[model samples]
Target: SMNPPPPETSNPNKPKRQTNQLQYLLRVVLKTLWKHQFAWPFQQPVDAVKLNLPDYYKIIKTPMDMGTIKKRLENNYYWNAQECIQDFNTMFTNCYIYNKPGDDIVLMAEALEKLFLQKINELPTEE
Candidate 1:
């Protein structure tokens, strides 16, 4: 029936998110999952930078305006190890529910393309 108050909008413990939209979004989700930078997706074999977590999250969260995130990715999603993990985290976790689901199978498949790819990869691969 209760929840913790919203986090401080200006968290002194947290660094200011960089200007890069993709990285900033990544940082948000990365923060949620690991509560620290340089962990999880950043450290794992996953190509977090190339994966563009922040932009991906924004697209999922606001698909209508995904053009902005797509533009950023097209112009500036090159790998950069020097960047902080939080940057990537910010993007991956920007989820939203636009409306209730319907019986549109094609629409559902289109919506789940990325997630389905991830699931497929988790299956044992053959040489």
Candidate 2:
């Protein structure tokens, strides 16, 4: 049973627009987290190939209008994918107050896991 204005007249382009919006939101979250070094442990050496996110890392390193994070002498060497996801969720919650109806961060998270963390264990050395 279609409840909202009969599915017959639904806009064909609506889904596309929503997906684009969600993707943009996901990028914003990713960049903000990376800016704060919330995803990785250290800034010493970023091995794109090793990390399995070559393009993603490059984009993260690119300068943006977002404010910088305070420099810390000691690096966080214990960072991992799960930790990064948790940190992302926390920061996203703080930043996004008004949630949308169809907002699905899981899709973006899955993409991150597959793109970056999936190949970590397959690598020769620990990531």
Task: Report the C-alpha displacement of residue 88, candidate 2, in angstroms.
Answer: 9.3
Cα-based lDDT at residue 27, candidate 1 = 38
lDDT of 1 by residue, 4-123 (tens): 232122334544423443353343322233332322322222222465444443334322222233333334532432332323333332322322345342243234334423433343
Off by over 4 Å in 2: 1-102
Give per-model CA RMSD: 15.8, 20.8
Per-residue lDDT of model 2, residues 41-78, tens digit only: 32223334564544533344232111111111012211
RMSD (Cα, Å) of candidate 1? 15.8
The candidate that achieves the highest lDDT relative to the unseen native structure: 1
TM-score of 2: 0.23
What TM-score goes with each of the models?
A: 0.24, 0.23
Model 1, position 43, has a per-residue lDDT of 28
- Report residue 86 deviation for candidate 1 (angstroms): 11
> What's model 1's lDDT at 98?
25
lDDT of 2: 0.32
